[PDB]
């Protein structure tokens, strides 16, 4: 018995087009259909410079924007050998972590709105509209902040942003507590989530989950502890790791990972060195407006970096960061030219949404939206 | 194993005046009345809402909204036709054609940003050498018809003169970065 | 005495040492079928001998873990059983030996990578206990 | 009787937040571009990162080389084996710093 389970609530899971082969109410197999959001991203990037390539990444995962620009930047610094300053690293993490918070605040309470709890959605989205007052203030666009450029980061924080991020972090433990007091204790929540989509660790490894769905099963594997790719080796934070694997562990993790991300934000705030914002290598970082206008040699680079590009040397690397969805890695083959060459984007949600087939076997049809909830399936990456 | 796991996870809470504590929580909703109480606290608290048309959300001088071609204080469009923004544009929205005007100084005969084919990433504002193209904080230009949304060659992007009073302010405050 | 492996699915095995001895003896016996002058057989022999030795010497699973610093004995059993699968697989489609042409181009690019880039750091040494 | 242990008193409504609106330049930021040692010393080939790298050394191995290497590898003694990334789980409630970071 085949059922074309589509997007239950649009605007939350946009193009979800499962084709469930059911058995009464018990689902026997879930066959997701991809491509409804397949923009030509892995082709369009081959046609544009390494700078023009960056805006696609904030548009790859639309609920955790800067994590993908941070995964791309670290793939055009893996090749460029472009050492970025300490302040660029600290800002880059303070925003990758603000993005982890922006994602878990959505991927928890959009999940909690698919399950049925209507209010956590709107509380978490007031919180997200506080964090977009930081995105929009530091770069310009509330969602797609093309801000974490290859060398360092686009431009320094405004002169009042750390004070505001602090005044937000002080009041954010309470918001997590409310999102938690409203959902963690509920017997209507546990019942809707405990023993739902349980993934034994061998399955989370096999299906390349590598995210909050690889730390549910108990595999202690965070690419901020495994492969520290910034000040992360300096910052202190504990990676919460589940013990059962059910969608109630992944929720409890995403609601603790939203507190450890608060620890990382507070650290990045309390220790942010007053250094240069971009790599001093002005052939990888366009010089400031003031310098390119006054200096002829800076003007030449501002011209050959906003038209030509880097021309990062010939290589091929797989740089993977811990994006909120999971291990978002961008395999970036680079022909010597200024344009990338098959900038393949390993995006979790392409490996997670595979897991829907075995996660939601023998679960009731109303659980198939809870699974899609805890996978944090955002179809931009799929 | 799940059978033994159940037996043990239920033999953990197996001492009187603990079975009673858990029974009371299930018998009289305790976690759920803590949900209702929080929900009530938020029902009575002030509302984080904004009656939009009259007051609008906070922005920043770096905010990227409607593209505006700036002008030099003494008229003379700031847009010398280098085509750097036409080059840097990721979506290739800007189409620039250049002609030595009769005065002799280069200028763009055609400077058409296609707003629909535009990602509002501010690359044009960065790439332009003289700050000729900047994004005005407008962001309120929803058009009834698509053809209007294609911003014509240097005529509608020349409406930035109205927004110059705010664009000049944002630039005077952002240029420090 | 072990309550549970934190990992889900890897069920705690009470008779860890015994099945480990069984698996490592099976592995030592089954590896004999691959040619001796193959790096795979030297490796299997060496680490299987080391783990079988440390499993015979020590008695508790905790001491097996402590000396043989390779995680948990349940994951060790997973590794040993997967190794037995591989040796019984390698017997088939035997890849041992090198054909005459053997063109293998080792390529080394030594460009240093910037430190602040994902670099898989080694992690704690078996002095974790 | 709820999640208010004198700590939710950090409430969401701020009412004094972004007190200095962004485009108001009370303090003019500076945002250093280059380190002071690299302002009047613009030698680049030393600082270069794009092109200052050893060239790719792609040398071929023929059967002789690999049989030599296989015969040279006499035994796989410990420390010729990849180290395990040891990570165990350990329950902790709020002990890191006392819940205050």
């Amino acid at each position: 018995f085949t059922l074309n389970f589509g997007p239950q609530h649009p605007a939350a899971h946009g193009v979800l087009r499962l084709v469930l082969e059911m058995n009464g109410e018990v689902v026997e197999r879930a066959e997701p259909h991809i491509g409804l959001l397949h923009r030509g991203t892995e082709k369009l990037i081959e046609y544009k410079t390494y700078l023009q390539a960056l805006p696609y990444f904030d548009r790859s995962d639309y609920v955790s924007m800067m994590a993908q620009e941070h995964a791309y930047s670290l793939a055009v610094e893996k090749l460029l050998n472009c050492e970025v300053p300490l302040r660029a690293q600290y800002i880059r993490v303070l925003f990758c972590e603000i993005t982890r918070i922006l994602n878990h605040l959505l991927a928890l309470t959009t999940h909690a709105m698919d399950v049925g709890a209507l209010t956590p959605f709107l509380w978490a989205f007031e919180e997200r509209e506080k964090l977009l007052e930081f995105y929009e203030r530091v770069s310009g666009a509330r969602m797609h902040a093309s801000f974490i450029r290859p060398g360092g980061v686009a431009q320094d924080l405004p002169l009042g942003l750390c004070r505001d991020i602090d005044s937000f972090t002080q009041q954010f433990a309470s918001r997590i507590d409310e999102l938690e007091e409203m959902l963690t204790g509920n017997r209507i929540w546990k019942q809707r989530l405990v023993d739902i989509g349980t993934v034994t660790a061998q399955q989370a490894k096999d299906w390349g989950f590598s995210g909050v769905m690889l730390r549910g099963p108990g595999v202690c594997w965070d690419l901020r502890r495994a492969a520290p790719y910034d000040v992360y080796d300096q910052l202190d934070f504990d990676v919460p790791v589940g013990t059962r694997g059910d969608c109630y562990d992944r929720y409890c993790i995403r609601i603790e990972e939203m507190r450890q991300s608060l620890r990382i934000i507070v650290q990045c705030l309390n220790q942010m060195p007053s250094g240069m914002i971009k790599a001093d290598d002005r052939k990888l970082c366009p010089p400031s407006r003031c310098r390119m206008k006054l200096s002829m040699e800076s003007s030449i680079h501002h011209f050959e970096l906003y038209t030509e590009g880097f021309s990062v040397p010939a290589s091929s690397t797989y740089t993977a960061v811990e994006a909120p969805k999971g291990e978002f890695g961008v395999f970036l083959v680079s022909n010597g030219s200024n344009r990338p060459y098959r900038c393949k984007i390993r995006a979790p949600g392409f490996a997670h949404l595979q897991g829907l087939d075995f996660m939601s076997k023998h679960h009731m049809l109303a659980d198939v939206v809870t699974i899609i909830g805890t996978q944090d399936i955002v179809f931009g990456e799929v | 194993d799940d059978e033994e796991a159940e037996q043990l996870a239920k033999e953990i809470s197996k001492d009187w005046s603990t079975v009673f504590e858990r029974s009371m929580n299930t018998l009289f909703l305790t976690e759920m009345v803590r949900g209702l109480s929080l929900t009530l606290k938020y029902f009575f608290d002030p509302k984080v809402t904004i009656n939009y048309p009259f007051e609008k959300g906070p922005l920043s001088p770096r905010f990227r909204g409607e593209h505006a071609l700036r002008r030099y204080p003494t008229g003379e469009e700031r847009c010398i036709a280098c085509k750097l923004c036409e080059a840097v544009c990721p979506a290739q929205a800007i189409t620039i054609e250049a002609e030595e005007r009769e005065d002799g100084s280069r200028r763009t005969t055609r400077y058409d940003i296609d707003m629909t084919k535009c990602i509002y990433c501010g690359f044009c504002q960065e790439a332009c050498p003289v700050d000729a193209i900047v994004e005005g904080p407008n962001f309120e230009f929803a058009t009834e018809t698509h053809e209007e949304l294609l911003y014509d060659k240097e005529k509608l992007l020349e409406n930035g003169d109205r927004w110059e009073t705010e664009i000049a302010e944002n630039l005077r405050s952002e240029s420090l970065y | 005495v072990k309550q549970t492996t934190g990992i889900v699915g890897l069920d705690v095995v009470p008779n860890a040492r015994a099945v480990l001895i069984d698996l490592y003896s099976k592995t030592l016996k089954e590896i004999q079928a691959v040619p001796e002058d193959e790096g795979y057989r030297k490796a299997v022999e060496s680490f299987t001998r080391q783990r079988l030795n440390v499993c015979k010497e020590e008695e508790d699973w905790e001491m097996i873990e402590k000396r043989l610093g390779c995680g948990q004995v349940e994951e060790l059993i997973e590794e040993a059983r997967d190794e037995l699968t591989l040796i019984g697989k390698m017997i088939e489609w035997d890849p041992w030996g090198v054909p005459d042409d053997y063109e293998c181009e080792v390529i080394e690019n030594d460009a240093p990578i910037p430190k602040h880039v994902p670099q898989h750091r080694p992690g704690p040494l078996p002095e974790q206990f | 009787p709820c999640a208010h242990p004198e700590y939710l008193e950090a409430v969401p409504k701020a009412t004094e937040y972004r007190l200095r609106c962004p485009a108001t330049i009370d303090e003019e930021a500076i945002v250093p571009s280059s380190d002071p040692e690299t302002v009047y010393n613009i030698v680049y080939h030393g600082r270069d990162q794009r092109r200052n790298r050893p060239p790719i050394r792609r040398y071929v191995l023929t059967k002789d080389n690999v049989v030599q290497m296989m015969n040279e590898k006499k035994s796989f003694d410990v420390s010729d084996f990849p180290k395990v990334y040891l990570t165990t789980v350990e329950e902790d409630l709020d002990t890191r710093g006392g819940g205050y970071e």
Partner: peptide, 24 residues
Amino acid sequence: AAAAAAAAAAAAAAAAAAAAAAAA
């Protein structure tokens, strides 16, 4: 249907961090 029902019993909540709390 003999499909495995979602048993809403489990072990009690105990926040499980990683071993790198104090000294890696």
